From a paper:
Merbecoviruses from bats, pangolins, and hedgehogs pose significant zoonotic threats, with a limited understanding of receptor binding by their spike (S) proteins. Spike (S) protein is the major viral surface glycoprotein of MERS-CoV and forms homotrimers. For the MERS-CoV S-trimer, NTD is known to mediate cell adsorption by binding sialic acid, while RBD is known to bind the human dipeptidyl peptidase 4 (hDPP4) as the entry receptor. The S2 subunit mediates membrane fusion and exhibits a higher level of sequence conservation among CoVs.
In addition, S-trimer structures of six merbecoviruses from different animal species were determined. Different from previous MERS-CoV and MERSr-CoV PDF-2180 (31) S-trimer structures, densities that can be modeled as linoleic acids (LA) were identified in RBDs of most of the currently reported S-trimer structures, with CN-HedgehogCoV-locked-2 S-trimer being the only exception. Consequently, the identified fatty acid–bound 3-RBD “down” conformations for the merbecovirus S-trimers are also designated as locked conformations. In the characterized merbecovirus S-trimer structures, the putative LA carboxylate group interacts with a serine from a neighboring RBD via hydrogen bonds. All of these residues are conserved in GD-BatCoV, three in HKU25-BatCoV and Japan-BatCoV, two in EU-HedgehogCoV and SA-BatCoV, and one in CN-HedgehogCoV. Overall, based on structural and sequence analyses, the sialic acid–binding pockets in GD-BatCoV, HKU25-BatCoV, and Japan-BatCoV show considerable conservation compared to MERS-CoV. However, Loop-N2 in these S-proteins is incompletely resolved, suggesting that further investigation is needed to confirm their sialic acid–binding capacity. In the GD-BatCoV S-protomers, the binding pocket for this unidentified small-molecule consists of hydrophobic residues (I125GD, Y148GD, P149GD, F151GD, L175GD, L184GD, I249GD, F258GD, and F285GD) and charged residues (R273GD and K274GD). Further investigation is required to elucidate the identity and function of this small molecule.
Numbering used by the authors:
A (entry chain B): 51 to 98, 101 to 344
B (entry chain B): 786 to 873, 882 to 913, 918 to 951, 965 to 1140
C (entry chain A): 345 to 591, 596 to 699, 709 to 745, 751 to 763, 777 to 785
D (entry chain C): 443 to 491
E (entry chain C): 1031 to 1079
F (entry chain A): 1031 to 1128
Write the structure that this text describes.
């Protein structure tokens, strides 16, 4: 985190400032914070037929929510990088994180970590990168096979098949949602929300906070595009206190001939800090100072 | 040449107590009906301070009368180049001093209309906070006349009086006579070195900036004390009126009234002590003029280091600026 | 009535010294209205008005943003018992607009009103609900309508105990107290209400949780004849571009540079609107400064307006006691602003003429182009007022031209 | 110097509509208390028969 | 004077913030700490002058 | 100023303690009297600071008066403009109210 570039700064809501510098208390990342790096890979496909899912241990680990977190998305795009499952240099594309947030966690029938109880907030990107799903449902594991209701469970993941749902004929609105429905059953859904995302390779910033008014979703796509300032675009009516979140491992089922390189996104915790924000003439914050 | 700045004048500010405390609200004015004597006392104290300041400035500048000078030539009088201290209504060195000091311009003619038309300073905060900055007693064309007459007060033209002042300190007639050209060029380089003296690391320019910053700090404190909530739900009477009930409204408005009245009293005391200090400094400046400028002082250190020869005085943003030409062996 | 009457009233004396006094300025009245209100959607109160309300420990929260509601209907439905408010009043809520409105409602007996007071030590503030005072709040207890869609639950219930057992013998008792505005961990034992007065619940907490044994006890109060409810409302003011307004739009193009009263998307006040160059983020409708004051506004006609506070014309009064003649100085104001604009001053001032000097427009001073060395009424910038029938505007000028011949002692 | 009393038949259930910050119909169309003088509002029960 | 002005209560129940947090509820805690804050700020302003 | 500051209410119902004690209950009487006490103590502190500044200024001006007496009254002054205008012949001092 570099505060001199105003990285991860959430813009104030309902007002703007011009050509003045203010000190503010809010939820900002710490300067020089390395954060947590998450990489999404491509599944096993030896022949140009699909196979297993190549994921990491992101689903098993449970992270405290605290005051929220901010996500840096697609900062390594437009660059030559290696596919994770192999050693093939490819152009890095942008991938959107998938989240699972809740207020109580336990174990599955195996005894492995996970198993969010009662109403669980799901932030699943869809549309092959052009749609965001916000769901608030009770998560119920399905039995049989590798699903978490039978005693051989390994991990749960979200998969996409680009030669089926990323085609130019149309974009499957329910791709990652139907992939997620194969592991858990969605019951007693409080709300289902859909947000449209424009397809581009620009770097993005995503934030999420919580207070008495609900869960607030911030994105640099709204407002300061081609920038880093994050503006509020959604207020989910999630009034129970979120205590934990988990990054859902999202592995793409692509062939050997049509593999792709996907960026690594970074998650930084938010803290109740004081920041000196520098507002420009157009109102966007271009530099900041972390007083601590 | 050593440079000394002596302040003579601070900015004259009068505060409209009703507009400052209440910002034109009827409920606040009804509550301030019981505090009218304190507002009247604030206005009377500030008026008395400004009146005494004006009388001190008039007494300082009343030295033109009963005082005769002589006309001088153009920029070269004798072999001495005096175009820097002479008017072409300000001297070039006075203009150079004034351009290197950042002063927020108080519009005295039509500043209210300029601040009304302005879109994206404290001079425009004057009419929104309730205070008014009074214009100075004399137009700068009178201060320039005073400084020009003091330059004239050095029959007996300037080079002859300069050589007389050199003869008085212990240099004989022969040494002065054979080296008139060297003395003239050394005086010219000493005068030309004054361009680089308007810098923060010299003390006198720092004192000029300190006086300007003190006036700006007084105005800034008066403007920014209006944002104190004083324990109320908000620092604005409009928010109190829009958020509360009639019996609870008077408590918060009275808290704001008491805080702003106490702050006005503190401002009045600060203005009084600043005005007394400026009057004493103006007396010091008049004594310094009468000793160093109108004559030659035989006391070391009063009119600068070394042996005093001749002193020149010019106007300043809030006082007088002195150029003490001295003697130093090398 | 006129100038020098305000001077007499401020000095509280019929005799004052001759001089130039800065009298109080004038009162500014709004010359128009700038209303800009959208066509908002009705707020969804159907969850409150239909269905059984929950208990206090399982309260429902309703957050309203960018909507218009009808307060008279809601107040007519509910028979309101005592209410307590801290940073707001109910009349202020019914009068103005605010950025958000958060309502917490539940089924609550009227006999337990004291357990919701801020200093309460009972179990309601410990395990069921604690009011938060970060925002202006009201605490309302009311009786639900009888024959409408709101239905009575079976009884009133609340959490009487909520603690953690540890110490490898389940013998160490540590109570788990809730935070202001938050739920309880023990609310999952009976989310729909406890059935008996002495219901005892036990649950093993996981390793990611505290790790002890959760113990929860719930009490039950019999249901009264009429359904009594509690409401914990809250408001916010500067957090959103759109506002929530309880239940016409004008234009500022014909009135620019004049003091108007504005109500812009819920933000109300008074100010002067002028055309300005667009600064700040456009999607944030309002531009503020370091002191949280409105300095700009992005209108619906695609014009950024610079907002300035309403100003009063400064006033100074010249007075001469001997000749009883007085003059009026408008400090640093041009005479065209006195004549064309405003024209709201004192009675005789509204009715020699207006003269433009170096210190501003003056009335009551006749120009004579006369020169004096000094005087007792300086106006500033080498100007003066010399009494004669009436005062005359003069200026101060300098005059600059001795062998001892005759003795003279000064 | 003077004592001014306003009295009227009033139920004790509608007592909270007489509080100074109320938004009900009693403060709007029936009676609004004035705070220009030191005042007190008393709710009482009349003597029985 | 700077050290001894810290023992003034400015009308609060105590000159100690610890005592105020020990003895009072949050709506009165925020009201009684604010008197100490305003008094100490005013005393600091007088000291600065 | 010292006499007229006693008429300030400082937010109380009256500036008189006798009017407060005859109009209010003890838990509010203590609050109003504490308001008056705090206001009068702050005003007394401001008066004390003003008196200290005035007395230091008067002491410095008295030293200046002693220097002026020693320069102009007990001896003739050769300095220009220190004791009157023009040249100096003799000076006389008398007492003043302050
Ligand atoms: C990866 O490469 C793509 C190449 O298209 C980058 O997208 C381009 O980013 C530039 C950034 O300056 C955009 O230019 C801007 O365009 C707007 C609208 O025309 C204009 O108002 C701005 O002044 C600026 O010129 C450009 O439009 C955009 N193009 C597309 C197709 O998105 C992308 O930023 C690169 N990402 C990374 C992480 O390097
Ligand atoms: C933005 O703000 C800066 C600083 O506040 C402005 O820069 C000032 O401009 C004025 C007028 O040209 C100068 O007199 C000052 O010396 C400048 N100050 C500094 C620190 O540079 C700038 O003009 C503003 N830009 C706007 C309002 O568009
Ligand atoms: C808010 O609600 C009240 C009450 O439901 C509405 O007042 C009613 O209006 C209808 C139609 O004009 C009348 O027939 C009723 O007699 C009214 N009842 C009362 C008690 O006044 C009111 O119109 C609503 N406000 C708005 C803006 O629609
Ligand atoms: C009325 C209970 C018995 C009081 C007398 C007994 C002991 C006195 C000691 C402590 C009392 C502290 C609690 C005060 C009232 C709490 C009310 C509430 O929590 O809402
Ligand atoms: C009591 C019904 C409350 C229903 C919940 C919905 C909205 C409430 C929000 C704002 C209005 C505040 C009303 C305060 C109570 C009225 C008291 C009175 O007028 O005397
Ligand atoms: C942070 O950004 C500034 C300006 O963009 C840059 O000078 C600085 O080197 C950056 N910090 C680091 C650690 O690279
Ligand atoms: C998202 O796109 C669909 C398809 O065009 C459209 O119907 C919908 O209104 C869009 N959503 C928003 C919020 O604009
Ligand atoms: C006197 O100085 C000015 C600049 O300070 C210069 O332009 C002028 O030529 C000088 N006079 C002579 C006679 O050299
Ligand atoms: C939460 O879930 C647990 C088990 O999954 C259940 O016993 C409890 O009643 C639930 N709480 C609710 C629905 O409030
Ligand atoms: C959950 O699983 C972890 C890891 O095996 C274990 O440490 C913990 O005790 C388990 N908790 C429960 C409640 O089974
Ligand atoms: C206001 O200013 C904008 C930009 O300067 C201009 O386009 C517009 O025409 C102006 N409107 C008026 C009424 O002057
Ligand atoms: C007064 O009249 C003279 C001559 O008519 C003119 O030069 C001068 O500017 C006038 N003064 C004012 C203030 O108009």
């Amino acid at each position: 985190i570099n505060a001199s570039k105003a990285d991860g700064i959430i813009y104030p809501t309902g007002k703007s400032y011009s050509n003045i510098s203010l000190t503010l208390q809010g939820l900002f990342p710490k300067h020089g914070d390395l954060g947590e790096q998450y990489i999404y890979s491509v599944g096993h496909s030896d022949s140009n037929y699909l196979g297993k899912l190549f994921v990491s241990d992101y689903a098993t680990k449970v992270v405290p929510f605290n005051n929220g977190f901010v996500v840096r998305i697609g900062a390594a795009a437009n660059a030559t990088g290696s596919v994770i499952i192999s050693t093939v240099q490819k152009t890095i594309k942008k991938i959107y994180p998938a989240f699972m947030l809740g207020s109580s966690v336990g174990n599955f029938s195996n005894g492995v970590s996970g198993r969010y109880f009662n109403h669980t907030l799901l932030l699943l990107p869809d549309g092959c990168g052009t749609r965001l799903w916000a769901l608030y449902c009770v998560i119920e594991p399905r039995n049989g096979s590798y699903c978490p209701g039978n005693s051989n469970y390994n991990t749960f993941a979200v998969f996409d098949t680009p030669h089926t749902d990323c085609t130019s004929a149309g974009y499957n609105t329910n791709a990652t949602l139907n992939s997620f429905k194969e592991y858990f059953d969605l019951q007693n859904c409080s709300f289902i929300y859909s947000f449209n995302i424009t397809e581009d390779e620009n770097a993005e910033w995503f934030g999420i906070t919580q207070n008495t008014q609900g869960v607030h979703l911030y994105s640099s796509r709204k407002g300061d595009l081609y920038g880093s300032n994050m503006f509020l675009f959604a207020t989910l009516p999630v009034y129970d206190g979120i205590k934990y979140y988990t990054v859902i491992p999202r592995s793409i089922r692509s062939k050997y001939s049509e593999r792709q390189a996907w960026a690594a996104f970074y998650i930084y915790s938010l803290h109740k800090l004081t920041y000196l924000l520098d507002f420009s003439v157009d109102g966007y914050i271009r530099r900041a100072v972390d007083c601590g | 040449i050593t440079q000394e700045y002596i302040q003579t004048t601070i900015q004259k500010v009068t505060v409209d107590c009703k507009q400052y405390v209440c910002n034109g609200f009827q409920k606040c004015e009804q509550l301030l009906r019981e505090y009218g004597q304190f507002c009247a006392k604030i206005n009377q104290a500030l008026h008395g301070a400004n009146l005494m300041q004006d009388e001190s400035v008039a007494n300082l500048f009343s030295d033109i009368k009963t005082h005769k000078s002589q006309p001088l030539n153009a920029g070269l009088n004798g072999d001495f180049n005096l175009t820097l201290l002479q008017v072409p209504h300000r001297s070039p060195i006075e203009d150079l001093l004034f351009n290197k000091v950042t002063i927020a311009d108080p519009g005295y003619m039509q500043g209210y209309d300029d601040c009304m038309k302005q879109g994206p300073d404290l001079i425009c905060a004057q009419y929104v906070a309730g205070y008014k900055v009074l214009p100075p007693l004399y137009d700068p064309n009178m201060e320039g006349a005073y400084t020009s007459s003091l330059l004239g007060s050095i029959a007996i033209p300037f080079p002859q009086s300069i050589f007389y002042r050199m003869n008085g300190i212990g240099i004989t007639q022969q040494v002065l006579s054979e080296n008139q050209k060297l003395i003239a060029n050394k005086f010219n380089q000493a005068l030309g070195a004054m361009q680089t003296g308007f810098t923060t690391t010299p003390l006198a320019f720092s004192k000029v900036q300190d006086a300007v910053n003190a006036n700006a700090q007084a105005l800034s404190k008066l403007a920014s004390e209006l944002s104190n909530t004083f324990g109320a739900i908000s620092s604005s009477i409009s928010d109190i009126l829009k958020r509360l009930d009639p019996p609870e409204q008077e408590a918060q408005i009275d808290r704001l009234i008491n805080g702003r009245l106490t702050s006005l009293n503190a401002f009045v005391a600060q203005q009084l002590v600043r005005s007394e200090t400026a009057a004493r400094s103006a007396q010091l400046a008049s004594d310094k003029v009468n000793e160093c400028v109108k004559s030659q002082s035989k006391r070391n250190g009063f009119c600068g280091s070394g042996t005093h020869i001749v002193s020149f005085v010019i106007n300043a943003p809030n006082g007088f600026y002195f150029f003490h030409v001295g003697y130093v062996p090398t | 009535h006129d100038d020098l009457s305000q001077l007499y009233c401020s000095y509280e004396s019929f005799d004052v010294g001759s001089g130039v006094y800065s009298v109080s300025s004038f009162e500014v009245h709004s010359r128009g209205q700038f209303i800009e209100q959208p066509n908002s959607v009705e707020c969804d109160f159907t969850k409150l008005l239909s269905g059984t309300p929950p208990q206090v420990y399982n309260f429902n929260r309703l957050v309203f943003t960018n909507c218009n509601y009808n307060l008279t209907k809601l107040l007519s439905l509910f028979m309101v018992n005592e209410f307590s408010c801290d940073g707001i009043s109910p009349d202020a809520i019914a009068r103005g607009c605010y950025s958000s409105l958060t309502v917490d409602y539940f089924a609550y007996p009227l006999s337990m009103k004291s357990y919701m007071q801020p200093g309460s030590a009972g179990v309601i503030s410990q395990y069921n609900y604690k009011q938060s005072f970060a925002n202006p709040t009201c605490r309302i207890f009311a009786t639900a309508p009888a024959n409408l869609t709101i239905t009575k639950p079976s009884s009133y219930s609340f959490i009487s105990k909520c603690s953690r057992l540890t110490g490898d013998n389940s013998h160490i008792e540590t109570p788990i107290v809730i935070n202001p505005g938050e739920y309880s961990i023990c609310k999952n034992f009976a989310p729909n209400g406890f059935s008996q007065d002495g219901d005892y619940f036990t649950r093993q907490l996981s390793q990611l949780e505290g790790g002890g044994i959760l113990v929860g006890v719930g009490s039950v109060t019999p249901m009264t004849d009429t359904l009594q409810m509690g409401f914990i409302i809250s408001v916010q003011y500067g957090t959103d571009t759109n506002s929530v307004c309880p239940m016409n739009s004008t234009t500022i193009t014909d009135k620019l540079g004049v003091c108007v009263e504005y109500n812009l998307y819920g933000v109300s006040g008074r100010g002067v609107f002028i055309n300005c160059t667009a600064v700040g983020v456009k999607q944030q409708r309002f531009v503020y400064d370091g002191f949280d004051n409105l300095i700009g506004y992005y209108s619906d006609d695609g014009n950024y307006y610079c907002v300035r506070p309403c100003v009063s014309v400064p006033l100074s009064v010249v007075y001469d006691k001997t000749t009883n003649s007085h003059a009026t100085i408008f400090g640093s104001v041009a005479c065209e602003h006195i004549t064309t604009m405003l024209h709201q001053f004192s009675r005789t001032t509204q009715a020699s003429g207006p003269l433009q000097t170096a210190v501003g427009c003056v009335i009551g001073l006749v120009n004579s182009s006369m020169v004096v060395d000094n005087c007792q009424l300086p106006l500033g910038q080498s100007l003066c007022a010399v009494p004669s029938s009436q005062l005359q505007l003069a200026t101060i000028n300098y005059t600059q031209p001795q062998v001892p011949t005759n003795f003279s002692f000064g």
